[PDB]
C-alpha cells in the first residue's frame, strides 16, 4: 500500500525507512512496466537521496537501487534524480567501503550518463571518471568489472558533442587492459568504448596507438563472438582513417589477413565494415595499396562489388577506386586491378542513384584509362578504353553527362572527349 510506504520513507526510524525503501525498490524492479512515474509523484526521491548518506549501508544500497531504476526510465525521470542531487553523492559512493554500494553507484551513474551527451558531461563534471577507473584496476569481482566497464562505455559514448578529450582520455590505459579480459561482456563493452574514443581527429587515434591498444584489437578481429568482432573492427577501421604512419601500425599488427577473413563473415555489417576499413587502407600510399594486393584481398573485393547488398557494394567501390591512385608511381597496380576484372563492375555503378558513388566510379575509370593510354603510347589503341566500350560502359559514362551536378558530368564529358571521340 503506497501511502503507508511513503509514511515509512518519511519516518525517522531506520527500520521503517529500510522496510519502506525496500518495498519501493521491489516495485521499481518488477518484470514489466515499473510504476516509475507514480513513485516520483509520491515525493520520495529526495528522501532516497538523503538515505545515500546514511551510516546504514543497507538503506544506502536499497535507496541506490531504487534511484538506479528511476534513472533507467525516460529523460524526464532521469532529470528528477539529477535535480535531487544524486550524482555528486553517487560519485562519493564510488569510494564506499561496501562493495555492493560501490557497485550500485557505478550502475546508477551508468544509467544517468547513458541518458544523453549532456547528462554524460554532467556526470563527468562531478568527477566520476577517476574513481571509476580506480575500481576497474582494483576489483576482482566479475559483476563489478562488467558493470564498471559498461558505465565507462557510456562515459565515452556520444557525438553531440563528444566528451572533452583531455577529460576522457585517462580511460585509454584502463581500456588497454580491459581488452585482455577473459570475460566476453567486459570485452564487448571495452571494445565499444574504444570504438567511440577512436572516432575523431588523428591526435585521438595517436593516443589510442600510444596506449598500445591496436595489437590486441587486431587479434580480436578473429574472436569467436560477432559481438566482439563488430566493435573491435569498428575500432580498427577508425584507426586506419588516420595518416599513413598510423595506418601502417594496423598493417604491421597483421590486420590484412584478418580483414580478408572478415569479408566472408556471416554478418552483413561485418563484411561492410571490413570493406570500409580496407578502403581507408587503399586510400594510403603506394606500399599500402601493394600490401592489400599482396594480401589477396582484391579478388574478394571485386566479387563484393557485384554481389552483396548496396551498402557493401558502395564500400567495395571506394576500396577498388582508391587503389587506382598510383598510376604514375606504379601502374602495375592498375593493370592488376583490370586483370582481376574491376572494369565492368565499376561501370555498372555509374547508374547508382547516389552521386557520390558515381563520382568515385568515374574517378577510378579515368585513372584506369590513363594507364591504358600510357600503354598505348609505348606501343595501337587504348586497350582499356576498348574494354569499357564493348561492355556497355561507354554508354553509361555518356549518360553521366546529364547528371546535373558538377564534377561528374564535367568528368564524363572530358573522358568522352579524350578517350571516346
Amino acid at each position: 500500500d503506497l501511502p503507508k510506504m511513503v509514511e515509512g520513507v518519511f519516518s525517522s526510524e531506520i527500520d521503517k525507512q529500510i522496510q519502506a525503501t525496500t518495498k519501493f525498490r521491489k516495485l521499481l524492479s518488477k518484470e514489466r512496466n515499473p510504476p516509475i512515474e507514480e513513485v516520483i509523484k509520491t515525493g520520495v526521491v529526495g528522501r532516497f537521496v538523503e538515505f545515500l548518506r546514511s551510516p546504514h549501508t543497507l538503506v544506502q544500497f536499497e535507496a541506490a537501487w531504487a534511484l538506479t531504476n528511476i534513472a533507467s526510465g525516460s529523460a524526464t525521470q532521469t532529470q528528477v534524480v539529477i535535480e535531487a542531487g544524486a550524482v555528486p553523492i553517487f560519485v562519493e559512493l564510488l569510494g564506499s567501503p561496501e562493495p555492493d554500494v560501490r557497485e550500485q553507484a557505478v550502475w546508477a551513474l551508468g544509467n544517468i550518463a547513458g541518458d544523453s551527451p549532456q547528462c554524460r558531461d554532467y556526470v563527468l563534471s562531478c568527477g566520476a571518471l577517476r574513481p571509476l577507473l580506480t575500481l576497474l584496476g582494483d576489483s576482482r569481482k566479475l559483476s563489478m568489472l562488467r558493470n564498471a566497464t559498461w558505465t565507462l562505455s557510456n562515459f565515452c559514448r556520444g557525438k553531440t558533442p563528444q566528451p572533452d578529450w583531455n577529460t576522457i582520455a585517462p580511460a585509454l590505459p584502463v581500456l588497454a587492459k580491459l581488452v585482455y579480459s577473459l570475460d566476453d561482456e567486459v570485452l564487448i563493452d571495452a571494445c565499444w568504448a574504444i570504438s567511440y574514443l577512436s572516432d575523431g581527429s588523428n591526435d585521438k587515434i595517436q593516443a589510442v596507438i600510444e596506449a598500445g591498444i591496436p595489437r590486441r584489437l587486431v587479434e580480436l578481429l578473429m574472436h569467436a563472438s560477432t559481438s566482439v568482432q563488430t566493435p573491435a573492427l569498428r575500432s580498427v577501421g577508425n584507426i586506419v582513417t588516420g595518416d599513413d604512419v598510423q595506418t601502417q601500425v594496423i598493417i604491421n599488427c597483421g590486420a590484412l589477413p584478418c580483414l580478408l577473413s572478415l569479408l566472408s563473415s556471416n554478418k552483413d555489417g561485418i563484411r561492410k565494415e571490413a570493406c570500409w576499413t580496407i578502403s581507408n587502407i587503399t586510400a594510403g600510399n603506394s606500399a599500402q595499396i601493394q600490401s592489400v594486393i599482396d594480401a589477396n584481398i582484391i579478388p574478394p573485393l571485386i566479387h563484393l562489388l557485384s554481389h552483396a547488398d548496396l551498402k557493401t557494394r558502395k564500400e567495395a567501390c571506394w576500396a577498388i577506386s582508391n587503389a587506382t591512385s598510383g598510376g604514375l608511381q606504379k601502374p602495375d597496380q592498375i593493370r592488376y586491378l583490370v586483370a582481376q576484372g574491376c572494369i565492368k563492375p565499376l561501370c555498372d555503378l555509374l547508374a547508382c542513384p547516389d552521386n557520390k558513388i558515381i563520382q568515385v566510379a568515374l574517378d577510378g575509370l579515368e585513372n584506369i584509362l590513363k594507364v591504358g593510354e600510357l600503354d598505348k603510347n609505348a606501343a595501337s589503341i587504348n586497350r582499356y578504353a576498348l574494354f569499357i566500350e564493348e561492355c556497355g560502359g561507354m554508354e553509361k559514362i555518356h549518360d553521366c553527362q546529364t547528371n546535373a551536378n558538377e564534377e561528374i558530368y564535367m568528368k564524363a564529358y572530358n573522358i568522352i572527349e579524350k578517350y571516346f571521340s
Binding site: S29, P34, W65, T68, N69, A71, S72, G73, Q104, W107, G110, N111, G114, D115, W150, S153, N154, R157, I188, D189, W192
Partner: peptide, 8 residues
C-alpha cells in the same frame, strides 16, 4: 550497448 539497464 544498451544506453540504460534496469536492475531486476
Amino acid at each position: 550497448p544498451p544506453k540504460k539497464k534496469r536492475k531486476v
